[PDB]
Amino acid sequence: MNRVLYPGTFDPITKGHGDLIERASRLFDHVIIAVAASPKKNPLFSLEQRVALAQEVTKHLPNVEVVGFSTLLAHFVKEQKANVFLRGLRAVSDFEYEFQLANMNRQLAPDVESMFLTPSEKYSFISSTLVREIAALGGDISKFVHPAVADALAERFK
Amino acid sequence: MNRVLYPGTFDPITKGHGDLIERASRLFDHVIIAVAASPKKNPLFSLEQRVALAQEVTKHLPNVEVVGFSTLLAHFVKEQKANVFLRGLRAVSDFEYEFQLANMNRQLAPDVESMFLTPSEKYSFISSTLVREIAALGGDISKFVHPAVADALAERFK
Amino acid sequence: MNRVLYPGTFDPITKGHGDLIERASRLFDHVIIAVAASPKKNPLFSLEQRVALAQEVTKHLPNVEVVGFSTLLAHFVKEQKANVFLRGLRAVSDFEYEFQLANMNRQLAPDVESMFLTPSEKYSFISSTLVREIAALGGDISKFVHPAVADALAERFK
Ligand SMILES: CC(C)(COP(=O)(O)OP(=O)(O)OC[C@H]1O[C@@H](n2cnc3c(N)ncnc32)[C@H](O)[C@@H]1OP(=O)(O)O)[C@@H](O)C(=O)NCCC(=O)NCCS
Numbered sequence: 001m002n003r004v005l006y007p008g009t010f011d012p013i014t015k016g017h018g019d020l021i022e023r024a025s026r027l028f029d030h031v032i033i034a035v036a037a038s039p040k041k042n043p044l045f046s047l048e049q050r051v052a053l054a055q056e057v058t059k060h061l062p063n064v065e066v067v068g069f070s071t072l073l074a075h076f077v078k079e080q081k082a083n084v085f086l087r088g089l090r091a092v093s094d095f096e097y098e099f100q101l102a103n104m105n106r107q108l109a110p111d112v113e114s115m116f117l118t119p120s121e122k123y124s125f126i127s128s129t130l131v132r133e134i135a136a137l138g139g140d141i142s143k144f145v146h147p148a149v150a151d152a153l154a155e156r157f158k
Numbered sequence: 159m160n161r162v163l164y165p166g167t168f169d170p171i172t173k174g175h176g177d178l179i180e181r182a183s184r185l186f187d188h189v190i191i192a193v194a195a196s197p198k199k200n201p202l203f204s205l206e207q208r209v210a211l212a213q214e215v216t217k218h219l220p221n222v223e224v225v226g227f228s229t230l231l232a233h234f235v236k237e238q239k240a241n242v243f244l245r246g247l248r249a250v251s252d253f254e255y256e257f258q259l260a261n262m263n264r265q266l267a268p269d270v271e272s273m274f275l276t277p278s279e280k281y282s283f284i285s286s287t288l289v290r291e292i293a294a295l296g297g298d299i300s301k302f303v304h305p306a307v308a309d310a311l312a313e314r315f316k
Numbered sequence: 317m318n319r320v321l322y323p324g325t326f327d328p329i330t331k332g333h334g335d336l337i338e339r340a341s342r343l344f345d346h347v348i349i350a351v352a353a354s355p356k357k358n359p360l361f362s363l364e365q366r367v368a369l370a371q372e373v374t375k376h377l378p379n380v381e382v383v384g385f386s387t388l389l390a391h392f393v394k395e396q397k398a399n400v401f402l403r404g405l406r407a408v409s410d411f412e413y414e415f416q417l418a419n420m421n422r423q424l425a426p427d428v429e430s431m432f433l434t435p436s437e438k439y440s441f442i443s444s445t446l447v448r449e450i451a452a453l454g455g456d457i458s459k460f461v462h463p464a465v466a467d468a469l470a471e472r473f474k
């Protein structure tokens with residue numbers, strides 16, 4: 001049994017994240033999407049909305065479950081009893097910070113493995129930040145996100 | 159005929175940008191400097207000042223025009239009837255942030271080409287950000303910017 | 317004699333910083349830890365606290381001294397009569413955010429050399445920012461900082 005925790009802010013969840021979750025749900029027995037509160041990013045969407053949006057996008061995947069959390073990731077992953085961290089790697093990705101994240105979480109949670117997947121090339125350039133900014137200026141983002149997300153964004157700036 | 163759009167925050171426009179603009183004006187029939195409002199960056203200079211500085215620095219180039227805009231770039235490029243995006247490439251900052259911007263703008267403006275130029279090595283290391291912070295602490299920034307920009311920075315903090 | 321300045325925000329100082337400083341004290345007659353006020357970052361700890369923590373961690377090194385400053389680095393280095401800047405370099409920390417920093421300071425303080433050291437691999441991944449957030453969520457950070465630093469973070473968040 002592998003249980004994998006996919007942590008992120010998901011503000012909002014994109015077609016990029018969803019590609020990864022598709023792939024991960026076919027690989028693992030249990031996939032948990034851990035949506036972090038991330039109060040210091042001043043997220044456009046509330047935690048509840050983000051969790052809700054992530055659930056909507058993933059409701060067709062039976063072994064995928066979505067949860068919000070605002071505690072320390074190293075604590076939370078033990079608390080979820082996941083044995084694997086999942087992260088995506090696309091652009092760079094940032095690649096500094098991913099390694100800095102992995103080695104520091106490995107000191108705090110030594111029995112949890114850090115693992116990476118890369119999205120389909122066709123979604124490797126979708127940024128949550130820029131999806132938000134395109135929406136805030138009235139641009140079509142239907143090609144970057146799930147329909148429910150596109151709608152939540154439209155109604156967010158109206 | 160080619161009409162080229164060089165979008166940026168230009169806060170302020172630096173000798174790096176000016177180098178690029180000299181080179182681009184020499185290559186294309188029409189070059190438009192599109193100065194983005196970029197409110198999420200809290201620019202030191204107002205859009206109107208930034209545009210004014212960009213005009214001052216480029217007024218000697220007859221095929222160069224300066225416009226401010228606060229809409230979606232993918233919209234604006236159309237209303238400007240430009241067929242090419244210009245961006246600078248150097249450092250590089252994040253060589254993918256440019257790949258990521260081009261690629262989703264390729265999605266919003268399929269008919270506009272993304273193009274890159276590089277400034278002279280002698281200007282390859284000037285950061286608008288560090289120009290602002292150096293100026294803010296009373297450091298001499300005349301070596302990084304056009305004289306008119308240097309006056310604006312001096313008077314910006316007094 | 318060489319006198320070398322190690323500038324940084326140090327919010328707080330880490331075992332990463334401390335390793336570099338250790339390596340620098342064996343190399344140079346005089347090492348100055350210049351803690352920048354850095355108000356644009358809103359530091360968790362005040363300049364005075366950060367200065368104190370750096371003193372505590374380095375007080376056993378007789379040729380190492382700690383100074384706080386809120387002026388321009390290119391100016392302050394002249395006030396300290398140091399001829400060398402020290403910066404750390406561990407994996408794409410900020411790629412050439414160090415080189416543009418170096419070359420822009422080369423314009424402001426031409427008689428001062430920029431020099432880099434890299435920390436022991438065991439400290440190549442410690443992030444001040446991530447230490448702050450782990451501490452804010454009650455995680456153990458003793459693997460990342462000196463005990464005195466570990467003490468100060470606990471009292472900061474209770
Ligand atoms: C795992 C974790 C630490 C990573 O946080 P994070 O990378 O900053 O946020 P995410 O994981 O959701 O992914 C970051 C996305 O948002 C961007 N981003 C990162 N920091 C950002 C910030 N302050 N503001 C806006 N956008 C940011 C990134 O560029 C990235 O992609 P994007 O360009 O498409 O927007 C996060 O899940 C978290 O905060 N967990 C719990 C709290 C915790 O344990 N902190 C200590 C970490 S060891």
Ligand SMILES: CC(C)(COP(=O)(O)OP(=O)(O)OC[C@H]1O[C@@H](n2cnc3c(N)ncnc32)[C@H](O)[C@@H]1OP(=O)(O)O)[C@@H](O)C(=O)NCCC(=O)NCCS
Nearest residue numbers: 133134165166167168194199229230231232284285286287
């Ligand atoms: C070109 C464009 C699209 C991207 O903007 P941008 O590249 O981030 O801003 P710039 O063009 O000036 O280039 C990056 C500069 O902004 C600075 N910058 C980036 N984020 C910053 C921030 N939060 N705060 C302060 N400065 C910031 C960078 O420091 C960099 O300058 P520097 O490296 O010399 O320090 C911009 O003109 C724009 O946002 N246009 C319209 C809005 C839009 O369409 N957004 C959707 C994007 S697809």
Ligand SMILES: CC(C)(COP(=O)(O)OP(=O)(O)OC[C@H]1O[C@@H](n2cnc3c(N)ncnc32)[C@H](O)[C@@H]1OP(=O)(O)O)[C@@H](O)C(=O)NCCC(=O)NCCS
Nearest residue numbers: 288291323324325326352357387388389390443444445446
């Ligand atoms: C030498 C100097 C410039 C270094 O600046 P700095 O590298 O950004 O700050 P630090 O030295 O503490 O090192 C970077 C640390 O702060 C982070 N950081 C860098 N820029 C940041 C920013 N805008 N906001 C928040 N954190 C930032 C880095 O990521 C790193 O933290 P980390 O451990 O989590 O990775 C410092 O002396 C300074 O900031 N100012 C001196 C006054 C001056 O002359 N400024 C103009 C410099 S040209």
